[PDB]
Amino acid sequence: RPSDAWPRHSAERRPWAQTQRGGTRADRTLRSVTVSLPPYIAKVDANIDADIAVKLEDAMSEISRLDSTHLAGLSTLLLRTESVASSKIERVEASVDDYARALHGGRGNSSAVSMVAATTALKEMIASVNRDAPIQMTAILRAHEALMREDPTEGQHAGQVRTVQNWIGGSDYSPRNALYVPPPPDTVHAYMDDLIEFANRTDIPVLIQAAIAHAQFESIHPFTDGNGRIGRALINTVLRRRGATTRLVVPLASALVAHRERYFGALNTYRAGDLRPLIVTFANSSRTAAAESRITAERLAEIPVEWRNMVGPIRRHSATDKLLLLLPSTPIVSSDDVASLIDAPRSSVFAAIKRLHDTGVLRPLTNRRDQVWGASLVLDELDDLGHRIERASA
Ligand SMILES: Nc1ccn([C@@H]2O[C@H](COP(=O)(O)OP(=O)(O)O)[C@@H](O)[C@H]2O)c(=O)n1
Missing domain, CATH: 1.10.3290.10 (Fido-like domain)
Known part of the structure; x- marks a missing residue:
């Protein structure tokens, strides 16, 4: 077989019957379907x-x-x-x-x-x-x-x-006019x-x-x-x-x-x-x-630097530093999760949250109570990557 050639699929005629009655008449009288048989490629x-x-x-x-x-x-x-x-x-x-x-x-x-x-x-x-x-x-x-x-x-x-015969496209109620019929x-x-x-x-x-x-x-x-x-x-x-x-x-x-x-x-x-x-x-x-x-890997790395320009001075071992540290791995955190995940008093942890919220590092994803928080730049990088990849497909 030539360059870029590959054993092609063959077809075979199988009986078929509607199990769930509906569709048009043509769906209900259909008694036969042509299945594709892929090659064995191993x-x-x-x-x-x-x-x-x-x-x-x-x-x-x-x-x-x-x-x-x-x-x-x-x-x-x-x-x-x-x-x-x-x-x-x-x-x-x-x-x-x-x-x-x-x-x-x-x-x-x-x-x-x-x-x-x-x-x-x-x-x-x-x-x-x-x-x-x-x-x-x-x-x-x-x-x-x-x-x-x-x-x-x-x-x-x-x-x-x-365990049943499927197909892709065509009629909703039978394999009539399917564009592809998988094997039995x-x-x-x-x-x-x-x-x-x-x-x-x-x-x-x-x-x-x-x-x-x-x-x-x-x-x-x-x-x-x-x-x-x-x-x-x-x-x-x-x-x-x-x-x-x-x-x-x-x-x-x-x-x-x-x-x-x-x-x-x-x-x-x-x-x-x-x-x-x-x-x-x-x-x-x-x-x-x-x-x-x-x-995206570069930009993810630039983000902590971006975060602390925004937040101002942060003491080398406060909650705010402990929190700002973990967000890159864990950008989706609740208040009770953060308080759990940081060795620090639960009300100075709740302060670091408010600080990161007020500076723009954190955005609220829930009203709830146990408010859930998201690192905006991380969540937006998620979204920017997808647009950049779709853009760069020409
Ligand atoms: N002509 C086509 C068009 C789509 N497909 C595949 O069929 C996938 C759809 O999966 P599916 O038939 O299980 O439908 P869902 O149950 O995922 O909604 C598509 O994402 C394609 O990979 C195909 O095999 N031949």
Whole structure:
């Protein structure tokens, strides 16, 4: 097979019947559906073009320099930036403060709860790998469980592969006019094993492996719901499993979210056996995400200096110094949390809070009582990174 060629998907005609009656008549009389059958890739090789190798290489240059930055706050921020962007791809959205409240346990905004869930699902899936530990099917199921646990009427089977026939697009009530039909459920176990073997290889360039592992995951589409968010989480798991990263996540979903149809497009093209758009999308996305994350690392470091110009003189060991010290790792803190977390009298801690509030370091996220506080510059860097990455995707 040529350069950037890949074994293409085949089709097969399966019987299909509506389990839940509704839709139009055409949905109800439909008796047959054409499923796509992805290749088995665990043993496949891919030779790819030079211009693409350079692009992958330039992405890895940035990914490597990002991962070698020695910093408080950075790792958590990047993880959350990726999760927020990955959720935005499935139109699960909320404001910065909605999300900050949800990170602290707030539950009134179900979108922000899901955004926090996708954050857990990525954090736990990456935690499981290259402690010489391979990518395991257990971590994928646990990540899906973490994401879909509190989901309404969708999290009924959180943590289990689908047992029914799904499809993407077309009719709401049948696979009529679907743009893609994943393989039948009785083949998902055979396919995930093949993928998990493929995702554990060490004889492929890391970005190519990540990129094809994602596309293949999306082609299998093993879950009833959530395949975008868990499938994208697998990208950074492969990065971490190969040592391509070690201490931080690459937030490429912020680049993907900026050109969504092109991303979905690379999945269609993968299925037809062309690797070039998938890998170019992955190389450009990773390059932009890592480059801007590096600038975010500088800016995060400039922030404490910014904070204390604002707050004025601070005594070298007061509460105000103790507090100002911890905020970079922990930018979302309640008054009772801070008082707990600082060795100092609980009412001189409550003074440092008021001082940081009055100087503009802290902003209130709750009225409540046990007021929850957010480091504004940290919360706004979270948001500025995402805009800068979307901007730099041309
Ligand atoms: N032509 C397309 C378009 C999207 N997709 C993937 O399907 C993901 C959506 O996941 P999903 O089908 O589980 O829907 P949700 O349950 O996450 O809302 C997208 O984020 C893409 O990765 C695909 O495989 N082929």
